[PDB]
Scaffold this active site. Structure first.
Site, PDB file in Angstrom:
ATOM      1  N   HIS A   1      69.962  29.560  52.415  1.00 35.88           N
ATOM      2  CA  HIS A   1      70.232  29.514  53.842  1.00 35.88           C
ATOM      3  C   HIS A   1      68.966  29.726  54.653  1.00 35.88           C
ATOM      4  O   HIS A   1      68.038  30.395  54.191  1.00 35.88           O
ATOM      5  CB  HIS A   1      71.271  30.561  54.231  1.00 35.88           C
ATOM      6  CG  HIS A   1      72.661  30.228  53.785  1.00 35.88           C
ATOM      7  ND1 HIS A   1      73.672  31.166  53.738  1.00 35.88           N
ATOM      8  CD2 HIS A   1      73.202  29.067  53.346  1.00 35.88           C
ATOM      9  CE1 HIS A   1      74.780  30.588  53.306  1.00 35.88           C
ATOM     10  NE2 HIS A   1      74.519  29.319  53.052  1.00 35.88           N
ATOM     11  N   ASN A   4      79.649  35.311  56.714  1.00 33.96           N
ATOM     12  CA  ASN A   4      79.955  33.895  56.497  1.00 33.96           C
ATOM     13  C   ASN A   4      80.347  33.556  55.056  1.00 33.96           C
ATOM     14  O   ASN A   4      79.541  33.689  54.124  1.00 33.96           O
ATOM     15  CB  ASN A   4      78.782  33.022  56.961  1.00 33.96           C
ATOM     16  CG  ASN A   4      78.875  31.593  56.455  1.00 33.96           C
ATOM     17  OD1 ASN A   4      77.923  31.070  55.877  1.00 33.96           O
ATOM     18  ND2 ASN A   4      80.022  30.956  56.667  1.00 33.96           N
ATOM     19  N   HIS A  38      67.848  33.617  49.234  1.00 32.40           N
ATOM     20  CA  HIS A  38      68.824  32.533  49.062  1.00 32.40           C
ATOM     21  C   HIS A  38      68.510  31.336  49.953  1.00 32.40           C
ATOM     22  O   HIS A  38      67.633  31.414  50.806  1.00 32.40           O
ATOM     23  CB  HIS A  38      70.269  33.031  49.252  1.00 32.40           C
ATOM     24  CG  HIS A  38      70.662  33.291  50.673  1.00 32.40           C
ATOM     25  ND1 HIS A  38      69.826  33.883  51.593  1.00 32.40           N
ATOM     26  CD2 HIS A  38      71.837  33.086  51.317  1.00 32.40           C
ATOM     27  CE1 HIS A  38      70.460  34.013  52.745  1.00 32.40           C
ATOM     28  NE2 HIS A  38      71.684  33.541  52.604  1.00 32.40           N
ATOM     29  N   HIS A  67      77.477  36.036  48.184  1.00 35.65           N
ATOM     30  CA  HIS A  67      77.322  35.370  49.478  1.00 35.65           C
ATOM     31  C   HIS A  67      77.136  33.867  49.305  1.00 35.65           C
ATOM     32  O   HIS A  67      77.686  33.064  50.077  1.00 35.65           O
ATOM     33  CB  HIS A  67      76.127  35.969  50.210  1.00 35.65           C
ATOM     34  CG  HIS A  67      75.824  35.306  51.513  1.00 35.65           C
ATOM     35  ND1 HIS A  67      76.613  35.463  52.632  1.00 35.65           N
ATOM     36  CD2 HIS A  67      74.800  34.503  51.883  1.00 35.65           C
ATOM     37  CE1 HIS A  67      76.098  34.768  53.630  1.00 35.65           C
ATOM     38  NE2 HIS A  67      74.999  34.174  53.202  1.00 35.65           N
ATOM     39  N   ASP A  71      68.078  31.425  57.203  1.00 35.82           N
ATOM     40  CA  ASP A  71      67.647  32.761  57.604  1.00 35.82           C
ATOM     41  C   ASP A  71      66.737  33.461  56.580  1.00 35.82           C
ATOM     42  O   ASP A  71      66.087  34.465  56.903  1.00 35.82           O
ATOM     43  CB  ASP A  71      68.825  33.640  58.062  1.00 35.82           C
ATOM     44  CG  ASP A  71      69.843  33.910  56.975  1.00 35.82           C
ATOM     45  OD1 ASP A  71      69.893  33.166  55.967  1.00 35.82           O
ATOM     46  OD2 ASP A  71      70.635  34.873  57.156  1.00 35.82           O
ATOM     47  N   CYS A 112      71.545  38.925  51.843  1.00 38.61           N
ATOM     48  CA  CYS A 112      72.884  38.766  52.438  1.00 38.61           C
ATOM     49  C   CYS A 112      73.973  39.017  51.404  1.00 38.61           C
ATOM     50  O   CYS A 112      75.166  38.819  51.656  1.00 38.61           O
ATOM     51  CB  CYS A 112      73.056  37.384  53.064  1.00 38.61           C
ATOM     52  SG  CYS A 112      72.050  37.049  54.516  1.00 38.61           S
ATOM     53  N   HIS A 155      71.777  41.950  57.483  1.00 41.99           N
ATOM     54  CA  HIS A 155      72.486  42.136  58.747  1.00 41.99           C
ATOM     55  C   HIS A 155      73.185  43.497  58.884  1.00 41.99           C
ATOM     56  O   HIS A 155      74.073  43.646  59.713  1.00 41.99           O
ATOM     57  CB  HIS A 155      73.522  41.027  58.928  1.00 41.99           C
ATOM     58  CG  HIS A 155      72.965  39.644  58.789  1.00 41.99           C
ATOM     59  ND1 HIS A 155      72.128  39.083  59.727  1.00 41.99           N
ATOM     60  CD2 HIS A 155      73.145  38.702  57.832  1.00 41.99           C
ATOM     61  CE1 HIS A 155      71.809  37.856  59.350  1.00 41.99           C
ATOM     62  NE2 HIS A 155      72.408  37.603  58.200  1.00 41.99           N
TER      63      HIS A 155
END
Ligand SMILES: [Zn+2]
Ligand SMILES: [Zn+2]
Length: 218
Positions: free
Chosen positions: A76, A164, A74, A136, A78, A155, A194
């Site tokens: 983001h 988040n 995705h 997410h 990270d 995520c 995570h």
């Protein structure tokens, strides 16, 4: 700040774990994978930074492996932080066209290669990228390894809490999570961003947390 961690999960599958410190969260960590197809190596998500992405690349390049491609689950950072550096290295980068569209909006460097479909094979019969629906983020995709029965859910897989919600779609997540469960009912391992590794139950646990987080928001 802890070093980029690389751990062999099993033959041809490594978990890379990189670290970030962000005020109001402390030291956060992030799991991705490196997947081998014989002596071809593939990055499933990039580290947060160009520097850690390089370390990740070098580690495998020095052991003889050829970095054939990278896929970001995705938009983001990270998952995408390493995209720019990899581009400058002519190491081929992939993201869905929605991820790329969202990366552009965010002012971020796009992946050189994209695909528009729900499903995309990065390696014929070995690496499958699949979009379950919004969760997410609008764009989150998972990476499936059929030979190994390993799913990297990025995520999107959030069995212990949703994290988040900034860019989240609480309305759509339960449906998307069910779609994921129906597609890969026989997953042996599920690697998330995570959370610790688990089996296919993690996909159900995600559906559950999606349904909860939704109800909470009303
Ligand atoms: Zn994210
Ligand atoms: Zn994340």
């Amino acid at each position: 700040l802890p070093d980029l961690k690389i751990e062999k999960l099993e033959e041809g599958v490594y978990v890379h774990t990189s670290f970030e410190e962000v005020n109001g969260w402390g030291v956060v960590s992030k799991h991705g994978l490196v997947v081998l197809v014989n002596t071809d190596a593939y990055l499933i998500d990039t580290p947060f930074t160009a520097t850690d992405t390089e370390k990740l690349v070098n580690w495998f390049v020095e052991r003889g492996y050829k970095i054939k491609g990278t896929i970001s689950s995705h938009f983001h950072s990270d998952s995408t932080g390493g995209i720019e550096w990899l581009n400058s290295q002519s190491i081929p980068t992939y993201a869905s066209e929605l991820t790329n569209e969202l990366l552009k909006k965010d002012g971020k460097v796009q992946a050189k290669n994209s695909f528009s479909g729900v499903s995309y094979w990065l390696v014929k019969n070995k690496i499958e990228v699949f979009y379950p629906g919004p969760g997410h983020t609008q764009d989150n995709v998972v990476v499936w390894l059929p030979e190994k029965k390993i799913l990297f859910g990025g995520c999107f897989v959030k069995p212990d809490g949703l994290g988040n919600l900034g860019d989240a779609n609480l309305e759509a997540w339960p449906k998307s999570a069910k779609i994921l469960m129906s597609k890969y009912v026989k997953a042996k391992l599920v690697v998330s961003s995570h959370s610790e590794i688990g089996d296919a139950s993690l996909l159900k646990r995600t559906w559950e947390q999606a349904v909860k987080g939704l109800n909470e928001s009303k």
